């Protein structure tokens, strides 16, 4: 089937996870060390745009650090290294002197 | 988790079998169907195709799985104990390359213990499959065809 | 003026009853939401019940 | 030789494997069907690896 | 009794398997999960790695 690209087009050690949504829509979510590429099983590359930034994917070894689950339509992605953090300065009422 | 369209449904009392490509389902309610308790379970994962006409002679269902040419018939035995569904085993393993390809009907008789597959790849022949089930043990299976001219 | 205060009392009794009936509602509706989600069936009929 | 297999992933009937040469990266499928030929024509299901 | 971190979990259908370095767990509820009936049992002791 169609060639994906150059030798270095994918990561040196990428994390690749096949996507099976439909009998017509089937894909491969390959994670470069920095960034994502997504090809159809026909070989055509479906471009990915990163709204809301990335810097979540960027990993030295994405094979070990990425855990994904492919639900019907879209996939949830966890970077094992990134530590979840509470959002300060988003309080419900800033001070609200109760009395 | 996989958008599977529904193609075939074979009604039985107690359970209805839903057959998507790559995912199979059983619709059993207990008591009345009564919307509330309708239930559905993912039993088996074997592959069915769009032109795989299933015709269930008894507890078990025969459906043709087309290859590039020379389709191979498959059999799935719907067991009431959904714990032992196992999978759909091929019945043309000993005789592949036999059925021409485009199958437009699968007919059989439960009493006479056979099912006939007739295909438009070779219109003349009726591909007889005669079986003898003895207390869930397959004693004999024979594949042959009838040529009317 | 007594009955006017008494009207306010019946307003409070109705108000307390509505909250008590509302506590059972969210428990009952919340519980049904659990089983429909886990029923893996979806559709219009489950939205209806 | 010099070929790295990045990921082999299987749909129920056939598996799609993407592998990297020292010049390119390819997508290709391995089909496990019993007798069927992979391509039109193809007299006897040839094993040519690409 | 042993502080075991949880690394792998595989959901089947009515039971979740929790795998920790040297102890394994099954998360089964019966009926609805519901928190009140969540349950967890220490089934096996074999060794898994990171």
From Swiss-Prot, chain C:
<comment type="function">
    <text>Component of the cylindrical core that assembles on the inner surface of the capsid during capsid formation and plays a role in viral DNA ejection into the host cell. The inner core is composed of stacked rings of gp14, gp15 and gp16 proteins. Following binding to the host cell surface, the internal core is disassembled and gp14 is ejected along with gp15 and gp16 into the infected cell. May form a simple channel spanning the outer membrane.</text>
</comment>
<comment type="subunit">
    <text>Interacts with the portal protein. Interacts with gp15.</text>
</comment>
<protein>
    <recommendedName>
        <fullName>Internal virion protein gp14</fullName>
    </recommendedName>
</protein>
<comment type="similarity">
    <text>Belongs to the T7virus internal virion protein gp14 family.</text>
</comment>
UniProtKB/Swiss-Prot annotation, chain E:
<comment type="function">
    <text>Structural component of the short non-contractile tail. The tail complex is involved in viral genome delivery. Forms the end of the tail, including the canonical tube, the nozzle, and the small extensions below the fibers. Once the tail tubular structure is formed, the interface between gp11 and gp12 generates the proper environment to interact with the six gp17 trimers.</text>
</comment>
<comment type="subunit">
    <text>Interacts with head-to-tail connector protein gp8, the tail component gp11, and the fiber protein gp17.</text>
</comment>
<protein>
    <recommendedName>
        <fullName>Tail tubular protein gp12</fullName>
    </recommendedName>
</protein>
